[PDB]
Symmetry: C3
């Protein structure tokens, strides 16, 4: 398992940290997982995904989420030169601090990127080639393909239309709501089911 590796000693990280990966998660041989990473149950990590917890850490990927081809997870440093926490570079979730927090039943679709500090709430679809950076995406959200959230909080239950780059909180507060007739309303549930089954199938051949 050359592709699952400790992070190196740095001025902000004095001991190597090794990923904690649940046995029901599947890491593709050509995915890469480095450093202080926790990956939950049934998580499918596809080829060419890179989860790199060597600058900002920790990075958490919750149960039944998926990390698809070419997705990148990385984060800005959380420890100062003085050794003090950089509060603006961490996100608090359930009373704990993370560089990147991915909740449960989250899909990170092909070539998307979540860059810390960032959190993605449960049951949220992050669409293909989408981008999340210095942002909190609520639960039950849909980032359509090529959308982006930079420096904002996306309210629970909203979607970002394809191609839209949201940098203003006033715009984020105004985003349209997911409804039963919205075209992507049931997509994440489908994608999560598929990827749980892919992880199970790939593990049976391992």
């Amino acid at each position: 398992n050359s592709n699952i590796r400790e992070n190196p000693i740095t001025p902000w990280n004095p001991t190597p940290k090794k990923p904690k990966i649940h046995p029901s998660a599947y890491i593709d041989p050509q995915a890469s997982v480095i450093g202080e990473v926790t990956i939950g149950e049934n998580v499918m990590v596809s080829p060419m995904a890179s989860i790199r917890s060597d600058e900002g850490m920790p990075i958490y990927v919750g149960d039944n989420s998926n990390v698809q081809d070419g997705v990148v997870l990385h984060a800005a440093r959380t420890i100062d030169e003085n050794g003090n926490i950089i509060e603006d570079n961490v996100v608090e979730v359930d009373g704990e601090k993370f560089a990147v927090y991915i909740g449960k039943n989250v899909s990170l679709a092909h070539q998307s990127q979540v860059h810390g500090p960032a959190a993605v709430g449960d049951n949220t679809f992050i669409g293909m080639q989408a981008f999340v950076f210095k942002s909190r995406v609520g639960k039950n959200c849909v980032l359509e393909p090529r959308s982006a959230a930079i420096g904002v909080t996306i309210p629970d239950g909203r979607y970002i239309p394809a191609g839209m780059v949201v940098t203003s909180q006033a715009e984020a507060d105004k985003l349209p709501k997911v409804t039963p007739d919205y075209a992507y309303a049931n997509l994440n549930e489908s994608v999560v089911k598929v990827n749980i089954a892919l992880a199970r199938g790939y593990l049976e051949t391992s």
Copy 2:
């Protein structure tokens, strides 16, 4: 050839499928090809490309096409829980059904993505970081870098300007036409020649 692999058994796929790759195609050691995939003659598949036919299948890449660095091919499931074909998730081309169909002399340039259901017609350039999803791109087309086609049919012989995200069929019908003086008019022919020669050169060292 650890990087050329069968897909796993899943509820929608009861037997493993293995890629069919012509001997004149070159698969980079750090490209990944999984599942029910057919790759034609002289196809150059560059490092970090991921062709993954494990959800929707089959994926077809025609003769003399190229799949460049970091390109992703994947597709939505084509078989229901009941085992019935999901017709909206397949494309018909020449009387056959595909999850993703890439025609002949097609360039999929660096970091682009074609996500099924989708078809790309012959002699079409899909530019760097471009995106094709639930769409039919005609033949002799040019998707400039960062362009996207989502949920539309691109008429033969049109181009999408750089950065434009086309989601409306009315907009797709109005796209500008490739002409001899268009800046990208002869690019695909050049890129196809280069990649055929790269595949030949890389195979001679293999």
Copy 3:
């Protein structure tokens, strides 16, 4: 070091060229470096980056720069079928000719792409998922995430706002100036420090 490779013989390249990589640079095992490439001191090349100098060449990455996850460097051919240099496909920097020139203290952030012909000047941040193609980016510049420069020269000391695709020189000449109170004004210095330290740390475990 299977991932550091010569380029193949082609009609435009009659002898194989091998990368020249300084001993203080770190190449991730799942990065790929092919062909006529020069990589300077302390350069961190992250997982899934592909530096491919097999069509246009040479590709140069200067001292203390970094090439992050999923970044692609490639270039259009520089030699004609007749064997004459294609002048429009090379960039001159300090009296020398390159397919891609990356200066010193440059960050190529996750999933960005620089496609030759192109030059990036010293101390410039190329943001996540950004794109540089047939362009000269000045020194002390910031391309925010999802920005792009195609067919233009970016003056020294300017930034491109997130998501903006610059294709017109008149627009490039008008881009806003980096100032001490600009949000990204000090980012590149920070990122360069981090990546120098990452390269040192990763090499100590190698």
